[PDB]
Design a protein around this ligand. Sequence first.
Ligand SMILES: [Zn+2]
Ligand SMILES: [Zn+2]
Lengths: 368, 368, 184, 184
Amino acid sequence: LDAELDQLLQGHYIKGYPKQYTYFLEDGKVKVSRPEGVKIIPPQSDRQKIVLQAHNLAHTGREATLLKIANLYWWPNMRKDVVKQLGRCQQCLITNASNKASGPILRPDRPQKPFDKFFIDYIGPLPPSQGYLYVLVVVDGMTGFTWLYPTKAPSTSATVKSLNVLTSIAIPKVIHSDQGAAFTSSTFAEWAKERGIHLEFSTPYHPQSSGKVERKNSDIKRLLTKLLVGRPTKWYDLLPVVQLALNNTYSPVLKYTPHQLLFGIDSNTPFANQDTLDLTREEELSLLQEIRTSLYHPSTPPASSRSWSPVVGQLVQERVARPASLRPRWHKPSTVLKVLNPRTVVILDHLGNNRTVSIDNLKPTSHQ
Amino acid sequence: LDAELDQLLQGHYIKGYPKQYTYFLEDGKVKVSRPEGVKIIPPQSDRQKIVLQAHNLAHTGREATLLKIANLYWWPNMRKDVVKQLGRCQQCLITNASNKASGPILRPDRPQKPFDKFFIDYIGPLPPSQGYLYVLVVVDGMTGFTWLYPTKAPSTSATVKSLNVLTSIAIPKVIHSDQGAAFTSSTFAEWAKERGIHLEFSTPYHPQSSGKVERKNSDIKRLLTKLLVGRPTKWYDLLPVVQLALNNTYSPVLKYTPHQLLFGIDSNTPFANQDTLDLTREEELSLLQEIRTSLYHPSTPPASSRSWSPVVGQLVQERVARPASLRPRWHKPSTVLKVLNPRTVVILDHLGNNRTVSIDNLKPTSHQ
Amino acid sequence: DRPQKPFDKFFIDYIGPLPPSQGYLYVLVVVDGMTGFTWLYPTKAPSTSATVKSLNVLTSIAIPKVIHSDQGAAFTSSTFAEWAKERGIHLEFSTPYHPQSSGKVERKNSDIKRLLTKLLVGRPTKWYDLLPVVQLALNNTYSPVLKYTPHQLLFGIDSNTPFANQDTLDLTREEELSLLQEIR
Amino acid sequence: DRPQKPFDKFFIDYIGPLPPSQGYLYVLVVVDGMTGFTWLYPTKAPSTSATVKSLNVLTSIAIPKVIHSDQGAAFTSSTFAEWAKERGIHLEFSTPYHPQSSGKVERKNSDIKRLLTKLLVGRPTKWYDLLPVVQLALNNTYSPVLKYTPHQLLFGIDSNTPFANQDTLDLTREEELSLLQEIR
DNA sequence: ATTGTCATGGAATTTCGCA
DNA sequence: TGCGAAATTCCATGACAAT
DNA sequence: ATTGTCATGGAATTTCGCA
DNA sequence: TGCGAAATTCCATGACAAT
Ligand SMILES: [Zn+2]
Ligand SMILES: [Zn+2]
């Protein structure tokens, strides 16, 4: 601060201060004549206050803050000081957007068998139809085969009623769902343990993780919309038709329908495939097992040019779920405990609870 | 139909029917033994009905429809027939999504002078503050300089009150706004003509077109959010501070603040730039005119690999604005009258009114 | 002739009336002929309407080429005929007083009646809730004649609920009595 | 010494009381010293509070290094002093009974009083709505001494509202009378 | 304690029918 | 042994969302 | 009758201070 | 006439939205 600036004025070299410039005194202030003009050199002990005053005018980032400061001052390594402050402005940290993209998505393996994994979900609310407002959608992971159940609420009770009917057919190893109230209830958990069914949940607020069923929801709504054109939206009576229509629709990339993948043979529906008429059922099942194992599986896409992948002990911020108007979109920083996979992490949230969390809902905290 | 199939059965060549296959009769049906198996060849006169039955099971697209049909039938150029039908399914046309992206955005020239063009807009509603719920935001196109006015409604009356205060300073050639009720009213139109001000409007539902002010809205909310952290959202008293803070903030790409661009000299605010202290005002204005003309202007980005640009007389569909649940997202097809620019067109909408419309709200109608 | 397949033929019949359970009195029984797979639907009556309502659910999942039944009024109605014809389902009837399905189906239907009777007695009114587990049991019961359970034949995989401890469909001396006492 | 600049010095004063117009009685006059640019704010009183309220608006757009005024009570209050000090604005006062701004400012203030008087008479109560156009006029009035209008000097461009037909600030024989009659 | 998906219709690529 | 056209495959585009 | 924008903080590139 | 470090520039990323 005062010491350094003293030595400077006589002309004795200080590391950081270029020797080729004239440092003089004026108005009780140490100054330097730099190419841009004459700047005041504040004592070291004054600099933080300065950086903070400039930054606080509009809570600006690195360059914008520096451009203010450089109007009056010069000192060695100014941006280092600016950045030190940005890294400590709580308001900036929790309000600013990230400018680093998530790492490239995973393409989880398709379940090996029908009934290995169900993805479930509610669509709605829809326009009321016979008192019904929601549709429970159940998608078998391996086959894509889907079951539809109309409900009056996306409740645990309605889920259990519907799934008892479905599991009359077969019992799945795993049911995957989002963190909706109807699936996170202890009652639903009991209903499952009672049956040997493992509940798996998506990370919170990340429907990509329920992509199988979410994507099927699109098709369901799309077909309903078409069938209801120029008629009142009376969808209740169409659910069975839609279910059957979609279960018997080809996926062009697979060259099979979900019905085919589930049974290895078409039922008495229009345009039924006849290519195994001369095989025995056993030969058919054999061919089916072969077809199931050789389906196209997509691969992880390229990372974008500026993505980030999470590291143990890294500082990261979780997105506020439903931020009020004029409130920060980010939680306070928190630490990466475990990296479950390159898209999924456990964090300790300064409370500190352990949360399992998608990186799509995180940003790396800026400025180390 | 019956004629062609007759000639075929004896063995006389028909264009379209490969000569190297055995065409026979069986069960009163013309058949052929193709590599995949034995297929029925329906008479020409039956084919449309067939394509339609298959397509209608689930209103499937080209391959999915074909895969159904090919289970039972073979005939020449099946996909041509499939596509002919898709192009005529009204329900598909207005329900399906597009898979062609808009052409690359325009980067309209920055207005040459302050007051050439204002962009205006309302933010809100916000949490009530002294009875106020909205902010009228006025952004000078050339400078970025912004004016903020708190209002109780995004009304014409409040706009006029605010803008009368603003235009005390200077009168703009043009005010650009979106198609909000407050700016499209005849009263506002009168208020403008009365003053020599040309009203310009964005295409409907396309806030990209008001990007200047929309983007400024982001900064306003972002700074308000920060200043209100851990306090009640009492924003009314902060508007003046925010206005001043943002008007005196550097844009890193320009190396100027909007205040500087408007006046060519800083007022008595923190960290005021002093580099023209020795110029006369006239020399300063001279330098200002130079700086204004040499600002960075962005250029049109590359088109994505599958974009479409509009052509006169092309069939296109406008996006339904606020589609009801289970209703189509697209209007019926319509024709491109004039191509105003590669991102903006006039269409005749089958009513037929003339609408000026952004291509971001159009898709090219599929299957010609 | 081409080998037999699932959905080639569904065999249907009513069981009941049973003691009321949550409002229901009958069970519509559907058995696929090739796999022996069984679906059960509770109804309030052996009516065409109850049959159509129930089969509408089943036929939302798979459609049989042929449905076979006895000459029950529900199955012989012109309404039920209209329904089948709409779905391209051929109806087929055993001659009156001469019911005839197939060995596998007969035996499957035997097991259903016995299994119900066994589980009913003691709680003759709680059967509505037991229908799912009854079906799982029937469908994961190994066929002595084929090498497989209906589940395996229908889906081409093992089940996550193998029923290894295949119990007695026979009644314990106790149940015999408490069932004899119920009918009093 | 360095050349004079906009925002170097604002000159402020009250005009009034005037006939009530939409509740207001006074006009706070702000004139930038270098450009002659003029801002006008309607107030209900020549109070510190009205001054602070009005100047808070102006200082949301630009902040003067110095404000100059007479020794009006509103401007000499310790509250107003606190306000200036908060914004790093130096206050500067003409000595009592000896008002002194500058030639340009004096003349600008002359024009303001005359222009108001002229437009007031005939509608002495409608002045609230005329303030915007009064300001545009004053600010797009060519300065004989400099080669430019305040608009040009402040913004470095021509205006979209040139006021070419610079009328008389002088009163027509009619207005003289109807103004003499108003004060009766 | 977990993880994107897949219909769609132009385009690009491959295969077919015929020499 | 290679051509033109048909068939198939490729794949960007967009939409399902949330607790 | 019209049309995207620009703060942000790592990275890439250039310039600086010194030989 | 070239080095290491600082300064500057580059630019992907995301968020403002609607009538
Ligand atoms: Zn900050
Ligand atoms: Zn269709």
